[PDB]
Short mmCIF file of C-alpha atoms and ligand atoms in Angstrom, two decimals:
data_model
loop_
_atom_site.label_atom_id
_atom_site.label_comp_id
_atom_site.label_asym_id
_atom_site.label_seq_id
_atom_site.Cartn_x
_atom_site.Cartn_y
_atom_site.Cartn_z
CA UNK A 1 -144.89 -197.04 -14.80
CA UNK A 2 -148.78 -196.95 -15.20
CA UNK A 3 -151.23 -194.70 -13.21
CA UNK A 4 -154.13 -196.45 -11.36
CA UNK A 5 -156.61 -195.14 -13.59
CA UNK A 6 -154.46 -197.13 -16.82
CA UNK A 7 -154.50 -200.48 -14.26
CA UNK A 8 -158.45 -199.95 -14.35
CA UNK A 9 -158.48 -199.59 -18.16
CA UNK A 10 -156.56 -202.65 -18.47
CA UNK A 11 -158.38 -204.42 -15.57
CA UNK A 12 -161.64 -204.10 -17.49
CA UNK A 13 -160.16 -205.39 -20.85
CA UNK A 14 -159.71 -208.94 -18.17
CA UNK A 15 -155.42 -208.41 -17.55
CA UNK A 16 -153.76 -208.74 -14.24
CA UNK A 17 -152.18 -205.72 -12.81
CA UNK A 18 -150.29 -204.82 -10.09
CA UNK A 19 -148.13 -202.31 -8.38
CA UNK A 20 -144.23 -202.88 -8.15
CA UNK A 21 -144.32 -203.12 -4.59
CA UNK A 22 -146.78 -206.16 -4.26
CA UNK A 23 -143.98 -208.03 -6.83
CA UNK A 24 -141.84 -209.31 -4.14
CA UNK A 25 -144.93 -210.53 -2.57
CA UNK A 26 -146.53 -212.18 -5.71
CA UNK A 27 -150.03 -210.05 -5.55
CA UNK A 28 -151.92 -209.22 -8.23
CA UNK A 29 -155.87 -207.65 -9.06
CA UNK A 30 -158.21 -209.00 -11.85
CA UNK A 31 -162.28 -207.86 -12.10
CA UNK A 32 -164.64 -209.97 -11.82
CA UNK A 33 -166.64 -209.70 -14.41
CA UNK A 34 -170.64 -207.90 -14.19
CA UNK A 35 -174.19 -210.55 -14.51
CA UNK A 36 -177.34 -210.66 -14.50
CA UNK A 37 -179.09 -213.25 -12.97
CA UNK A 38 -182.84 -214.90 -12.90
CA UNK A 39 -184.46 -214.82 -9.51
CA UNK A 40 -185.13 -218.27 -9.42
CA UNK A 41 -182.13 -219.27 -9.87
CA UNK A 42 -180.89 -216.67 -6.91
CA UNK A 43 -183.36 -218.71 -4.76
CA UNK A 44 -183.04 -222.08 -5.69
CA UNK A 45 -179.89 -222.92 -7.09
CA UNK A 46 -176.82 -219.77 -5.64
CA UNK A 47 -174.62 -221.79 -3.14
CA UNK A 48 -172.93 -218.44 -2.25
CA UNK A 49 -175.56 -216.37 -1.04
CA UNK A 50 -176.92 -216.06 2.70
CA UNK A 51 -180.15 -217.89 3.43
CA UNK A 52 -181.70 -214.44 4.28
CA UNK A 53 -180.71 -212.52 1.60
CA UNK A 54 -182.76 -215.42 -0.86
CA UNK A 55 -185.48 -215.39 1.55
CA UNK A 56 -185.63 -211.49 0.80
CA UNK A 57 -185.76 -211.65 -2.90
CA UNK A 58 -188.04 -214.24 -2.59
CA UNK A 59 -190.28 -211.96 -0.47
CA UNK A 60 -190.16 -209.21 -3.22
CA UNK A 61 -189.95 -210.65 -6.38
CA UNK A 62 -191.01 -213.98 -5.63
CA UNK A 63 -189.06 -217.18 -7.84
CA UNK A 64 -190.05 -215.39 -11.33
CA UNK A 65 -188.03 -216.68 -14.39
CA UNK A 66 -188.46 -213.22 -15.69
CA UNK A 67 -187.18 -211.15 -13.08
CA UNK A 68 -183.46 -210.28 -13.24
CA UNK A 69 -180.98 -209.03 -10.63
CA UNK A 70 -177.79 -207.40 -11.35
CA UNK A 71 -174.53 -208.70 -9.80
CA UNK A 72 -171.69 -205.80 -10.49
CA UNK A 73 -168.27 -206.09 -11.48
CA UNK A 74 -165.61 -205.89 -8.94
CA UNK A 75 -162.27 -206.16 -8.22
CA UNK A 76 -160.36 -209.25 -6.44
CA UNK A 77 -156.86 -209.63 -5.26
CA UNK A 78 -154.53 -212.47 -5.55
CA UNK A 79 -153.32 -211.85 -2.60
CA UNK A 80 -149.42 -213.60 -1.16
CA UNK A 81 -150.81 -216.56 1.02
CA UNK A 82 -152.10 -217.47 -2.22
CA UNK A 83 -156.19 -216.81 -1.72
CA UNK A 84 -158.05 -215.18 -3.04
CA UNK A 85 -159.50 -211.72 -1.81
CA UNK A 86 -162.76 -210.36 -2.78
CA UNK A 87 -163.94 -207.31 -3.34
CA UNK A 88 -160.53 -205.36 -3.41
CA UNK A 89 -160.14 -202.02 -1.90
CA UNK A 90 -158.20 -199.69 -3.68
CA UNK A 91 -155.96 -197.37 -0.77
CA UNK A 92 -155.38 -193.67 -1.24
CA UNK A 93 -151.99 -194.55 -1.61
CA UNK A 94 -153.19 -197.15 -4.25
CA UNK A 95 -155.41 -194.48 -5.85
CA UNK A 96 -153.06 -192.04 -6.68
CA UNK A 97 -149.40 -194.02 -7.45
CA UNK A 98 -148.00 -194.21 -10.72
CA UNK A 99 -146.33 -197.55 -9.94
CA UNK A 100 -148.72 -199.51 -11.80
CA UNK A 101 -147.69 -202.82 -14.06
CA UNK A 102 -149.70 -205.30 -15.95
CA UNK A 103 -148.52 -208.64 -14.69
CA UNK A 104 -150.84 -210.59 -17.34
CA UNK B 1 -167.71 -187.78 -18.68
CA UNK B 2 -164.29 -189.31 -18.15
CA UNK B 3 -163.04 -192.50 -16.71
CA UNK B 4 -162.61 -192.35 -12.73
CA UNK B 5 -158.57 -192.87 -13.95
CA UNK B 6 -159.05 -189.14 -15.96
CA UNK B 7 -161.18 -187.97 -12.46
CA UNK B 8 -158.06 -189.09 -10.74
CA UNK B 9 -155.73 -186.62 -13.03
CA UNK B 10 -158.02 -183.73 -12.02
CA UNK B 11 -157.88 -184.43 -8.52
CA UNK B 12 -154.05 -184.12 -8.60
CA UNK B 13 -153.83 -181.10 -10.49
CA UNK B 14 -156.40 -179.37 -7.68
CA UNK B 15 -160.50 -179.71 -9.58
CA UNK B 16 -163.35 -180.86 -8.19
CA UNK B 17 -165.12 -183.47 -9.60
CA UNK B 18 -167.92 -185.90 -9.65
CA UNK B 19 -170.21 -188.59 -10.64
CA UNK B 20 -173.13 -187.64 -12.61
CA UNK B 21 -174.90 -190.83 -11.53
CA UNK B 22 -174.35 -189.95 -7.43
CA UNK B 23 -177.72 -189.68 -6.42
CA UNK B 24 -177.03 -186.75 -3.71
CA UNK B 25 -176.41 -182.81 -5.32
CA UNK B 26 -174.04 -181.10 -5.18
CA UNK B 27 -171.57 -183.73 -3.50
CA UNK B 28 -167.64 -183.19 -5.13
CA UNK B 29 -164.78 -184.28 -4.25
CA UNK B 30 -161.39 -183.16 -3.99
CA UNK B 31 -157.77 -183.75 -3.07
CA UNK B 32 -155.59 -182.68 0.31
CA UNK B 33 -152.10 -182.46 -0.51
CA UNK B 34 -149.42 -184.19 0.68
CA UNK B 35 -147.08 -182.25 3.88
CA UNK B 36 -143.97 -183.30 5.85
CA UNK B 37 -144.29 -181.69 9.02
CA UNK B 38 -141.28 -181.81 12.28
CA UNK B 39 -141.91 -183.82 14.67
CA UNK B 40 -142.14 -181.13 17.64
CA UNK B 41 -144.96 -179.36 15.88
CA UNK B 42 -146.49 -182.84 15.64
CA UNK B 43 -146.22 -182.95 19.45
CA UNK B 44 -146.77 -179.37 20.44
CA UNK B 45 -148.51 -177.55 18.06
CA UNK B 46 -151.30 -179.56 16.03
CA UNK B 47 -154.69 -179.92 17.69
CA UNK B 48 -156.00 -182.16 15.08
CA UNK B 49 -153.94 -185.56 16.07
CA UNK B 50 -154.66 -188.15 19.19
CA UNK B 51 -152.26 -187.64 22.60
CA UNK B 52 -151.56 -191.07 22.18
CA UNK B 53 -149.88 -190.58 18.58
CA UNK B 54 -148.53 -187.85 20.04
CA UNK B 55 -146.71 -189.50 22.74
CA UNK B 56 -145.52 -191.91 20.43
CA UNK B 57 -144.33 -189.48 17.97
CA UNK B 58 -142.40 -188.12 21.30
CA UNK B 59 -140.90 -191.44 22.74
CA UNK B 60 -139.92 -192.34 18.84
CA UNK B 61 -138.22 -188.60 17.32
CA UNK B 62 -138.02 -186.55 20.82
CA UNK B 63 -138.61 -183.38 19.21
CA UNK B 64 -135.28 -183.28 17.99
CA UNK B 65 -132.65 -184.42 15.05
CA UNK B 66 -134.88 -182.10 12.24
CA UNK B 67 -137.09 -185.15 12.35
CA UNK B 68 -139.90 -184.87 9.74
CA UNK B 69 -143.06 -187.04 9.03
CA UNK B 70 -144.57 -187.09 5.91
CA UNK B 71 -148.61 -186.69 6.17
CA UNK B 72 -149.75 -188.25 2.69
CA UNK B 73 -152.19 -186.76 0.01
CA UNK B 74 -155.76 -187.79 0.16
CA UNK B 75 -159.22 -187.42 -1.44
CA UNK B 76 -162.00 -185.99 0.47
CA UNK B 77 -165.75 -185.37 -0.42
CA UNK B 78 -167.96 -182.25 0.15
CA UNK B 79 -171.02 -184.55 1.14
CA UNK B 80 -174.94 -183.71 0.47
CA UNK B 81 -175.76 -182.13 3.95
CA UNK B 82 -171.92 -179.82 3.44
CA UNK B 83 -170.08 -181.52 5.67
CA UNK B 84 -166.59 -182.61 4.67
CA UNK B 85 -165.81 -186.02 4.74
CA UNK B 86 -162.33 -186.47 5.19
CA UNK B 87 -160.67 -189.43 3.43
CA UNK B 88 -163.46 -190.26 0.82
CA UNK B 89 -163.14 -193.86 -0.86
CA UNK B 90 -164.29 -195.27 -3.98
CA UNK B 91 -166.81 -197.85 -4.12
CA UNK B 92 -166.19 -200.58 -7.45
CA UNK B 93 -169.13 -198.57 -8.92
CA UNK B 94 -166.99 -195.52 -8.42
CA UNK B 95 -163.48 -197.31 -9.68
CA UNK B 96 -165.21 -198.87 -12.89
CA UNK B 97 -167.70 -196.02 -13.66
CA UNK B 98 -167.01 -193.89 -16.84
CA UNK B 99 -169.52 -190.85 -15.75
CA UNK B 100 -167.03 -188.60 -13.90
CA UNK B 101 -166.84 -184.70 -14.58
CA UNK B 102 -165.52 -181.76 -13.17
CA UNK B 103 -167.27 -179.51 -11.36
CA UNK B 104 -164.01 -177.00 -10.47
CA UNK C 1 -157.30 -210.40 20.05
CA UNK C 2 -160.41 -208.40 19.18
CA UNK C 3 -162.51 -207.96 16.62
CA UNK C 4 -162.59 -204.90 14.05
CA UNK C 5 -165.95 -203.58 16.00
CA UNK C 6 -164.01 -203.34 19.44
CA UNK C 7 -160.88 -202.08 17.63
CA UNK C 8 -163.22 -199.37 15.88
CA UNK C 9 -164.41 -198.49 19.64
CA UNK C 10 -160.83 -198.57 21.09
CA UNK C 11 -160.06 -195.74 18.05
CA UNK C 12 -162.68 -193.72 19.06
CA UNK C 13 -161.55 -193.41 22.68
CA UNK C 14 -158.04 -192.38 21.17
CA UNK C 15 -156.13 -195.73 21.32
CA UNK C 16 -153.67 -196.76 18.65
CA UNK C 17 -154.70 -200.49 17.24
CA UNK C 18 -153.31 -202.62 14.76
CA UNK C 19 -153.72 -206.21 13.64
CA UNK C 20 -151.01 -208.86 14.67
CA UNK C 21 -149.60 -209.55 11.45
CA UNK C 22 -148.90 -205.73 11.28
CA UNK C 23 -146.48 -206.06 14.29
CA UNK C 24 -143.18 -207.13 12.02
CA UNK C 25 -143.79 -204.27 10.02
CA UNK C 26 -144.71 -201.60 13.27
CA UNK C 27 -148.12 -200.14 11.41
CA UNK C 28 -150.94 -199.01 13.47
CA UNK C 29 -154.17 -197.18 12.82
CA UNK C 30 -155.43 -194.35 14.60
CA UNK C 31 -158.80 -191.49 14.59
CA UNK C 32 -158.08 -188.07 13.63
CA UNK C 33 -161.07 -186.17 15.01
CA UNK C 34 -163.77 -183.73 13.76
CA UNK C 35 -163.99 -180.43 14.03
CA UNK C 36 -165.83 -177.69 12.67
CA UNK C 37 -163.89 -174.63 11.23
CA UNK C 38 -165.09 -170.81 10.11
CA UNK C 39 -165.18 -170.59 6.18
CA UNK C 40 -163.11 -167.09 6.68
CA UNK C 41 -160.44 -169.52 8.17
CA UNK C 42 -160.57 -172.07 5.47
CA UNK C 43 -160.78 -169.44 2.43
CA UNK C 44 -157.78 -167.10 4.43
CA UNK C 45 -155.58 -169.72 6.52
CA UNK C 46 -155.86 -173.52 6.25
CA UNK C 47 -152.75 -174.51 3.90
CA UNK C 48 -153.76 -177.59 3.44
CA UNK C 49 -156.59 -177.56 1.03
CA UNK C 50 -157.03 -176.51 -3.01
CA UNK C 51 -157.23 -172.96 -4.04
CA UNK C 52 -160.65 -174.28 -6.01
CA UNK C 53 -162.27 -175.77 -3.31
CA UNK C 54 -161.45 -172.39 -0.54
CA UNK C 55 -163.26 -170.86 -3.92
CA UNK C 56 -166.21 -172.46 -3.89
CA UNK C 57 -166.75 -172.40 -0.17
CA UNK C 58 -166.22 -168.73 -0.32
CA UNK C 59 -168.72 -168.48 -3.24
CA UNK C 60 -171.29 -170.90 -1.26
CA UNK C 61 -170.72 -169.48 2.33
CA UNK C 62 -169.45 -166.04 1.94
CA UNK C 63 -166.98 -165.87 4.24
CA UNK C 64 -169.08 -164.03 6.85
CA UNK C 65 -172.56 -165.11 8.93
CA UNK C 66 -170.35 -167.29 10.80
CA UNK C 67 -170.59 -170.23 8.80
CA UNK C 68 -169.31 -173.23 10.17
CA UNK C 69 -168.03 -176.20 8.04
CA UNK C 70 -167.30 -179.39 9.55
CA UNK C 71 -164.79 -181.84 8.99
CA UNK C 72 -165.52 -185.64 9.57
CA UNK C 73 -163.26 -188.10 11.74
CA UNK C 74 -161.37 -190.88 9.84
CA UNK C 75 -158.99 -193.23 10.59
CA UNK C 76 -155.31 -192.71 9.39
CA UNK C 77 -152.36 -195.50 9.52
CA UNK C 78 -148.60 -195.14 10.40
CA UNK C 79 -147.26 -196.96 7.94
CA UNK C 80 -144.54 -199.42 7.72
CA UNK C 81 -142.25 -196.87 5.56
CA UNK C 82 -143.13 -194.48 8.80
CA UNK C 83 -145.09 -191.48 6.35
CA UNK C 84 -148.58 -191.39 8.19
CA UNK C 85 -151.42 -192.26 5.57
CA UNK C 86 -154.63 -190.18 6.28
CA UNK C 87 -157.82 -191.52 4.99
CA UNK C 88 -156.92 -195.33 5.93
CA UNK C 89 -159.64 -197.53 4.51
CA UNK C 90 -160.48 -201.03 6.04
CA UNK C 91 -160.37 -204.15 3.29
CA UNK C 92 -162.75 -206.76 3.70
CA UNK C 93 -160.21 -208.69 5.94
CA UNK C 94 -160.11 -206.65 8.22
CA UNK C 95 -163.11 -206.08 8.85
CA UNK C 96 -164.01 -209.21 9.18
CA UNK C 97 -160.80 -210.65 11.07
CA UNK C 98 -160.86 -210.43 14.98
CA UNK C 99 -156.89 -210.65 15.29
CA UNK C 100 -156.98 -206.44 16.75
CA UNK C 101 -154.70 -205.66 19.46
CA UNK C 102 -154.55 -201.91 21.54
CA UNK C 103 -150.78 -201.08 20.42
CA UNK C 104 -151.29 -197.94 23.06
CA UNK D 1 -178.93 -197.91 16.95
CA UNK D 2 -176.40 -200.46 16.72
CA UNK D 3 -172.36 -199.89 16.30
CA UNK D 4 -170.66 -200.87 12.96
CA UNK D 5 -169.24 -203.27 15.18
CA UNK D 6 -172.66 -205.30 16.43
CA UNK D 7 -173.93 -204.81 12.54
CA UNK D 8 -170.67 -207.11 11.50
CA UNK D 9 -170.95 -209.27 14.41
CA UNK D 10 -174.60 -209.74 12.87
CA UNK D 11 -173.25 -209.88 9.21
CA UNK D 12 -171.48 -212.77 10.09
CA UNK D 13 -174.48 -214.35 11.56
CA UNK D 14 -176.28 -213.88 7.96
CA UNK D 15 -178.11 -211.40 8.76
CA UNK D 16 -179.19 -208.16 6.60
CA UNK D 17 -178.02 -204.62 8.34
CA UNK D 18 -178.41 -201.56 7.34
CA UNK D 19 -178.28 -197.69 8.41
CA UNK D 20 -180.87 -195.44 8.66
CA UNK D 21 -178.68 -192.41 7.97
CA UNK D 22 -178.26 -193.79 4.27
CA UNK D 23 -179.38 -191.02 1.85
CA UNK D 24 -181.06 -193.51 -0.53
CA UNK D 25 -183.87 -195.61 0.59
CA UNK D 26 -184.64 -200.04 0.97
CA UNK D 27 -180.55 -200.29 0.40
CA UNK D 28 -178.97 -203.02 2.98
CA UNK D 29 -176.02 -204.87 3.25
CA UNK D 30 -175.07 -208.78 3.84
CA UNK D 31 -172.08 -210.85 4.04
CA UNK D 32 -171.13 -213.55 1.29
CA UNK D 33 -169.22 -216.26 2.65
CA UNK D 34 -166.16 -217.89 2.20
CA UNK D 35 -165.39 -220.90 -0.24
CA UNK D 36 -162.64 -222.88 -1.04
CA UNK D 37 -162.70 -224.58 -4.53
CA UNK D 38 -160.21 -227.02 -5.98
CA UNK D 39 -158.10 -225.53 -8.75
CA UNK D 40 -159.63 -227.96 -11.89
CA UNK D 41 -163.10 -226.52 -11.03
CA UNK D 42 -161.26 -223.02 -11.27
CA UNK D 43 -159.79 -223.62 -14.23
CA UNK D 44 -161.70 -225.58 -16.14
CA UNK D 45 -165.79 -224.72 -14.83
CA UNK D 46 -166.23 -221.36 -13.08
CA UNK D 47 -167.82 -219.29 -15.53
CA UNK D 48 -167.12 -215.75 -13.35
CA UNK D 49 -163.38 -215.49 -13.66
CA UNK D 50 -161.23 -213.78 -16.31
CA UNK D 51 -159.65 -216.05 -18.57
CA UNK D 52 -156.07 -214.13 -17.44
CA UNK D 53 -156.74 -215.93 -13.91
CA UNK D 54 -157.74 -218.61 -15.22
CA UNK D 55 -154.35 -218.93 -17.19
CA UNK D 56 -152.24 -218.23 -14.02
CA UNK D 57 -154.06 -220.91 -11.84
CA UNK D 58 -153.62 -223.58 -14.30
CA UNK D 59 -149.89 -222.36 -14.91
CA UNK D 60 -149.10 -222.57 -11.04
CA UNK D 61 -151.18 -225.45 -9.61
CA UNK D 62 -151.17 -227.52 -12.67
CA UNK D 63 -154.76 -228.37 -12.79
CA UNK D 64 -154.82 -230.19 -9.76
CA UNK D 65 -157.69 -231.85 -7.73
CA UNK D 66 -157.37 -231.21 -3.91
CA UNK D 67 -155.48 -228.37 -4.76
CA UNK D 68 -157.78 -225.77 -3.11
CA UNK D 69 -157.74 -221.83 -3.33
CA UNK D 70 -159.50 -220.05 -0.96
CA UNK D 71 -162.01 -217.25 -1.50
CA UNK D 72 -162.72 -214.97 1.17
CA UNK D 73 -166.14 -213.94 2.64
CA UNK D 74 -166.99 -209.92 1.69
CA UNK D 75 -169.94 -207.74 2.07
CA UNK D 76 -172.71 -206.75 -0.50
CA UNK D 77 -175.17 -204.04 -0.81
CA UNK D 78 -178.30 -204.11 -2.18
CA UNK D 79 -178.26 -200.92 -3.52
CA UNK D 80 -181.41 -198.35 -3.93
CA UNK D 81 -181.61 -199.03 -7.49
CA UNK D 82 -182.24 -202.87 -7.07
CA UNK D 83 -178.59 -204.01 -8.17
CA UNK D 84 -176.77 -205.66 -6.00
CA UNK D 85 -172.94 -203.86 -5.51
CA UNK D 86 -170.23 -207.19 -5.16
CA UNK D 87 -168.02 -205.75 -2.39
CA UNK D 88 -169.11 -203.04 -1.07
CA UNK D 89 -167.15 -201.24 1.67
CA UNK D 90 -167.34 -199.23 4.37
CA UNK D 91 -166.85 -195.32 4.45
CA UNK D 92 -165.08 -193.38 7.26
CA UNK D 93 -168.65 -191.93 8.08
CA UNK D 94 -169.96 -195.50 7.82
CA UNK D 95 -167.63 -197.07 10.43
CA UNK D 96 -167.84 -194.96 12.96
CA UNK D 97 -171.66 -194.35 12.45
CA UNK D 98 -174.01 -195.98 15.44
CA UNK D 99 -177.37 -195.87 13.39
CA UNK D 100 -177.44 -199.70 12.11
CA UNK D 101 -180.50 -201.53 12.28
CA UNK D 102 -180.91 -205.49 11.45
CA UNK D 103 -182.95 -205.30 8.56
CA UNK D 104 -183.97 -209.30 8.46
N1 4BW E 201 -170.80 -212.36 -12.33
C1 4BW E 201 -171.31 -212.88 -11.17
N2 4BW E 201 -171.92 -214.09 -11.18
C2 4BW E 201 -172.44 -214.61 -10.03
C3 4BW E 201 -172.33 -213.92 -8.85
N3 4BW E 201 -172.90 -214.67 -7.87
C4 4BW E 201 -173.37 -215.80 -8.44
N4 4BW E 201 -173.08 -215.75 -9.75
C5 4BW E 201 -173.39 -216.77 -10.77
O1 4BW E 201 -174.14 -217.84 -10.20
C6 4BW E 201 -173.46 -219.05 -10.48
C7 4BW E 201 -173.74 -220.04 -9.38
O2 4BW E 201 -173.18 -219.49 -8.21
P1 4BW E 201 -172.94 -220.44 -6.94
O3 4BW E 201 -172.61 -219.48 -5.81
O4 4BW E 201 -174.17 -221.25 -6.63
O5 4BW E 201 -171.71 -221.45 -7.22
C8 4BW E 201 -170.43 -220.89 -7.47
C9 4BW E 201 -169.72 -220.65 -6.16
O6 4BW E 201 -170.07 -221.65 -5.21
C10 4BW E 201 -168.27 -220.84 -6.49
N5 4BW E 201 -167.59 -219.52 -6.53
C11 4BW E 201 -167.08 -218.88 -7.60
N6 4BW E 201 -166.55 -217.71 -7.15
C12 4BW E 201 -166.74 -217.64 -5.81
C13 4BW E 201 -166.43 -216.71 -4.81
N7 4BW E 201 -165.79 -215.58 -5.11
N8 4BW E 201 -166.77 -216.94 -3.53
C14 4BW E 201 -167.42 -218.07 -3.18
N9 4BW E 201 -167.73 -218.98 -4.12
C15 4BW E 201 -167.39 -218.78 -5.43
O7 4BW E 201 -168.21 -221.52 -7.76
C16 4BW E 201 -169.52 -221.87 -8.19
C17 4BW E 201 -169.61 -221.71 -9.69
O8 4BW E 201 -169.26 -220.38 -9.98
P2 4BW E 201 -169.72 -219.71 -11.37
O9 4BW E 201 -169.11 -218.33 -11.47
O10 4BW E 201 -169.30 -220.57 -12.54
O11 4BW E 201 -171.33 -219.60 -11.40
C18 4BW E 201 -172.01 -218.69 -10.57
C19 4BW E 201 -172.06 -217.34 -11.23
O12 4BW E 201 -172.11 -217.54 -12.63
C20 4BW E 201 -171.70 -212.70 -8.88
O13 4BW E 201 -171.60 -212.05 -7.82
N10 4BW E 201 -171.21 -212.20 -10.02
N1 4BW E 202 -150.89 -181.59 4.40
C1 4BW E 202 -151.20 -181.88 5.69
N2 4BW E 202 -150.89 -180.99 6.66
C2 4BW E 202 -151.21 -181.27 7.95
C3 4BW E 202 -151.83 -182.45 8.27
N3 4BW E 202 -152.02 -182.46 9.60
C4 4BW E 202 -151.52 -181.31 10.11
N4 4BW E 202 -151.03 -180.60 9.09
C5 4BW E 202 -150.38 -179.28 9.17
O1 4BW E 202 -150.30 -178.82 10.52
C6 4BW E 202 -150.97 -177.57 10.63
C7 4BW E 202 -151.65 -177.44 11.98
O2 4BW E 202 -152.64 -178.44 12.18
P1 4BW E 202 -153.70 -178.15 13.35
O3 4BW E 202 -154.50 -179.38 13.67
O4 4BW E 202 -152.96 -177.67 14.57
O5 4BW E 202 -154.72 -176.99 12.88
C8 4BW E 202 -155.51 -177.17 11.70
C9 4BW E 202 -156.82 -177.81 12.07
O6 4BW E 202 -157.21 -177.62 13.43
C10 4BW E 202 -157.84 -177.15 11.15
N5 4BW E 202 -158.22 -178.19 10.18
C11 4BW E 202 -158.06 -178.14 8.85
N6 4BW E 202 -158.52 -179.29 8.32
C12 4BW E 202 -158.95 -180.05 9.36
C13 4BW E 202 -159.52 -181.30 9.43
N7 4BW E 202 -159.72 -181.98 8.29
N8 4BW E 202 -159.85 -181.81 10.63
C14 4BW E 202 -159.66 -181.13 11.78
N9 4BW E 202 -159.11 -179.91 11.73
C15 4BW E 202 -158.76 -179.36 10.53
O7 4BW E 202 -157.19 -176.08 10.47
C16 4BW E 202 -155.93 -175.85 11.08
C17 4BW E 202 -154.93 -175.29 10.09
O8 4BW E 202 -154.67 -176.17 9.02
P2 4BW E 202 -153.38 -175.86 8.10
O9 4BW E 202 -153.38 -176.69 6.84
O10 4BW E 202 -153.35 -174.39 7.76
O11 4BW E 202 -152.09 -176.21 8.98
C18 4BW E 202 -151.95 -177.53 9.48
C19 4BW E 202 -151.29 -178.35 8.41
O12 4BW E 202 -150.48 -177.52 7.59
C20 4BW E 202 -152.13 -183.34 7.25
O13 4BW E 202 -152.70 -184.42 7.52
N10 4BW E 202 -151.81 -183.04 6.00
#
C-alpha cells in the first residue's frame, strides 16, 4: 500500500514497517537511532567494538572527554528466526515496491 | 532537496538524480527498466549473460512453449571517472538522507 | 560449503552459486559482465536505458570521437518467483556466512 | 592487493581493511560483532532501540531472563568525514574489486 520512500518516513518517526510479503514470515525493519559518543568512552567502556578499531581512535584522538564521534542511524531487520539483523540492506526490488505496511 | 523516497519517484518516471552531499561530481544516477525477454533469445541471442545461465535457461524452458523471463528494473550510477555502474545501492546515509535533487 | 569470498571468485569465473538455505526455494546468483559500448550505440540503439540519460551522454560525449562508455559487472539473482533480479546486493549475512555452494 | 574475499576473512579476524581505489581518503572498514542479550535488558536498559521494538519484544517474550535475541555481527566504515557509517555495505564495484589493503 505504501512506497519505500513512505516506510523510510515512517521508519525515522521510530514505527515498524514491512512489506506484505515478509508477513507470512513475521519480518519487520525499525532504525536505529543516530549518537554521538565521547572518545573515552569508545576506548574504555564500548563492549561492541573491535579491539583495533579502539586502539585506532585512541591513536588519533587519544581518550579526550571532549572529542566526539558520530555513530549513524541505520536500519535493522527483525528478521523470521527471530534475531535480529543489523544494518539492513534495502534490495532493488525492496527499493522500488509499493507493497509497503507499517506493522507498528 | 527531497527525501531519497521523492529521489525514488524520479527515478521511476526516467530523471537523474543525486546527492548534493556525494563528495564525487558529477556522479547521477538513474533507473533501467524492467523487460521480459523469450527464453531462446536468452540462449541465442544476448551476449551480456553467463553460458552457464544460459544452459540452465536451456535445460529449464528449451527454447520453446513462448517461455518468457522477466529481467527486473534497477538503479544504476554514472560514477566520477564515467563509468556506469550497473546495479547502484544505497548506503543508510543514502536511504535516510534528505539532500537528493535532480539533475535530469 | 564456502565462504562468500570463494563464492564471489566462483562468480567471476562464470559459475552459478547460492547459499543452502536458498535450495527449497531454487535461487541462485550469478555475474553479468562488463563491457564497454559506443555512445552512438547507446544514444541510437540500446532499449534498455532512459531517454534522459542517452541525452546527457549525447550532450557529454557527442556521439562521435569514438567514445567508449563502460558498463560495470554485477551480480544478478534468479529468484524464487523465477523473474531474474539484476543488481543483486549481498546483506550482511551473507557476506559473512560461509554456507556457499557452486549450483553449476 | 587483496580480494574482497581475504579483506572479510580479515574482518572477521578484527582487523581494519580498506581499498585504495576509494575516492575519499583515511576511510576503512571493520566488523562489529555479534551479541546475544536477554530480552529484560532489551526491554527494559538498552538505550539504542526504538521504543516500537521495544514494545514488540516485551509483548512476545514477556520480559523474560534467559530469553536471548541474537544480534548479528555487520560491517562499519569509518568514513572520510570522521563519522563512523553503522552498516555499511558493499557495492557491486566493491566486491569484485582486488585493491584491499589491511589497514591495522
Ligand atoms: N546510537 C548508537 N549508540 C551506540 C552505538 N555503539 C555504541 N553505542 C552506545 O554505547 C553504549 C555502550 O555500548 P556497548 O557496546 O558497550 O554495550 C551495548 C552492547 O553490548 C549491547 N548492544 C545493543 N545493541 C547491540 C547490537 N546491535 N549488537 C551488539 N550489541 C548490542 O547492549 C549494550 C547496551 O546498549 P546501549 O544501546 O544501551 O548503549 C550503547 C550505546 O548507547 C551505535 O552504533 N549507535
Ligand atoms: N530491460 C532489460 N533488457 C535486457 C536485459 N538483458 C538483456 N536485455 C535485452 O536483450 C537485448 C540484447 O542484449 P545483449 O546483451 O545481446 O546486447 C546488449 C548489450 O551487449 C549492450 N549493453 C547494454 N547495456 C549493457 C550492460 N549494462 N552491460 C553489458 N552490455 C550492455 O547493448 C546491447 C543492446 O541492449 P538493448 O537494451 O538494446 O537490448 C537488449 C535488451 O533489450 C536486462 O537485464 N534488462
Amino acid at each position: 500500500s505504501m512506497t519505500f520512500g513512505q516506510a523510510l518516513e515512517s521508519l525515522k518517526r521510530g514505527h515498524l514497517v514491512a512489506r506484505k510479503g515478509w508477513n507470512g514470515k513475521g519480518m519487520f525493519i525499525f532504525m536505529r537511532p543516530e549518537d554521538s559518543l565521547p572518545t573515552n568512552m569508545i576506548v574504555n567502556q564500548v563492549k561492541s567494538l573491535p579491539e583495533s578499531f579502539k586502539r585506532w581512535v585512541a591513536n588519533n584522538h587519544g581518550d579526550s572527554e571532549t572529542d566526539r564521534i558520530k555513530f549513524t542511524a541505520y536500519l535493522c531487520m527483525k528478521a523470521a528466526d527471530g534475531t535480529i539483523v543489523n544494518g539492513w540492506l534495502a534490495s532493488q526490488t525492496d527499493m522500488l515496491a509499493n507493497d509497503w505496511v507499517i506493522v507498528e
